[model samples]
Target: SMEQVAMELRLTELTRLLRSVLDQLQDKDPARIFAQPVSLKEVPDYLDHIKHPMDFATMRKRLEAQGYKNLHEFEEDFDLIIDNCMKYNARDTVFYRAAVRLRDQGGVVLRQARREVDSIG
Candidate 1:
């Protein structure tokens, strides 16, 4: 299809754009840098040790007070928070890794896809 050609150029442009942005991000010292973070353990006891009890009714009230219908309403703000962690946290930290897996894997995922396609296509 003719559309495939459009998509091809669009994809290439965005790939370069992403690499440019990432390169810019990598070039300078971003603020509030910290030492690499430690990883979390996966023991049930360890996980549950700090877990907070869930309360749906109180949570609904709190969400209403905060002008959110549900957690869905907060999803839009997640990108800002996730990227803040990814860019500002120390590069070697597990914090940034979790941030990507949770909120914005696309950035890292797309970067990886670009390389894979270049080799395979």
Candidate 2:
């Protein structure tokens, strides 16, 4: 029972941490570009550029479903959200810059969280 309790606690700890990290990302997005999926009607070629699309709304669903078993999984999606933008948009466009800025700022939140928890021992 104690082992089961420990596993549950660890999952909760990581989930809570991911939630905090995700919150910052959603709020930090410039023009809320990363808040939802790219409209296929508007950006018709989006899927051609990004084979695996990701967005905050989808990430929220994944989080709610407990789909992220670890921080790495969450981080990968986070990176994908930014990476896809940089891949699909030109460097001078607002979308590209937004992705760059988000990555620059978002990475710190994850890094700090890891540092804080690692030091808890």
Candidate 3:
């Protein structure tokens, strides 16, 4: 139980950190700086191919290959990406809560079914 509580606290702290990072990113909005839409269809695809989240070095290489001359330009595009990701993350949190509740209820039902089977046997 203590471990579970510690894990929950860690998750809450991580979520707060993510929210802070997202808020800081909002300072640089891509739509305001770029004349055309930054084609980001490839970003999610590229991220999926990676085994882990791209660190600063890997991200710099990928962005350079994508025609970004200045690394600072990423500030604008990354803000947009982080903003959308946070929105989806908020929804995901809700789904996770519901799923946990359902899982616990299902466990109770399974235990009762197992008891019935044991009696019959």
Candidate 4:
């Protein structure tokens, strides 16, 4: 009985991890930016349902609005979050790749967001 329960728990965890990785990779695709409207209402809900590291989209948008448009600008913050995740436990490679992509495209996304925000502001 104990073994069965443990196995079930492990399976559930794996499923969640796979789902999170898929979601992160989908979100990281450059096409996603133009595919949907990035709004606060949608962002938080999306982030809440997924795992961390992948949730940086909101903050990335925010920093962009603040006029910080440099990929390296968010490196420290991204690395900090990644480091925290690593320290706490293991993570999926897809999640790691998504995080790296975010860090890599931080400046470009920030600039894009800034321009968009400026038009709206």
Best by TM-score: 2
| lDDT (Cα, tens digit) per residue for candidate 1, span 1-121 | 8998877665555444444433333222233121122223523342233233222232334333444322233233334445556654566787566555543433554456457555544
TM-score of each: 0.30, 0.88, 0.28, 0.28
lDDT for model 4, please. Answer: 0.45
**Ordered list by lDDT, greatest first:** 2, 4, 1, 3
Across residues 30-120, which tens digit of lDDT does each residue of candidate 2 receive? 5898998999999898788889999999999998777888777988999999999898889999999999999988878889866855675
Candidate 4 lDDT score at position 106: 50
For model 4, residues 1-121, the per-residue Cα lDDT tens digits are 9998976665555444333433443455553432233344745554443344423554445443542333344444445544533433336655455445655655454455446434533
User: Which residue segments of model 2 deviate by more than 4 Å?
Assistant: none
Off by over 4 Å in 4: 1-58, 67-69, 91-121
Q: lDDT at 8 for candidate 4?
A: 64
Question: CA lDDT, every prediction?
Answer: 0.41, 0.86, 0.39, 0.45
* Candidate 3 vs. true structure, TM-score: 0.28
Where is the poorest 10-residue window by lDDT in model 4?
31-40
lDDT-superior candidate, 1 or 4 = 4
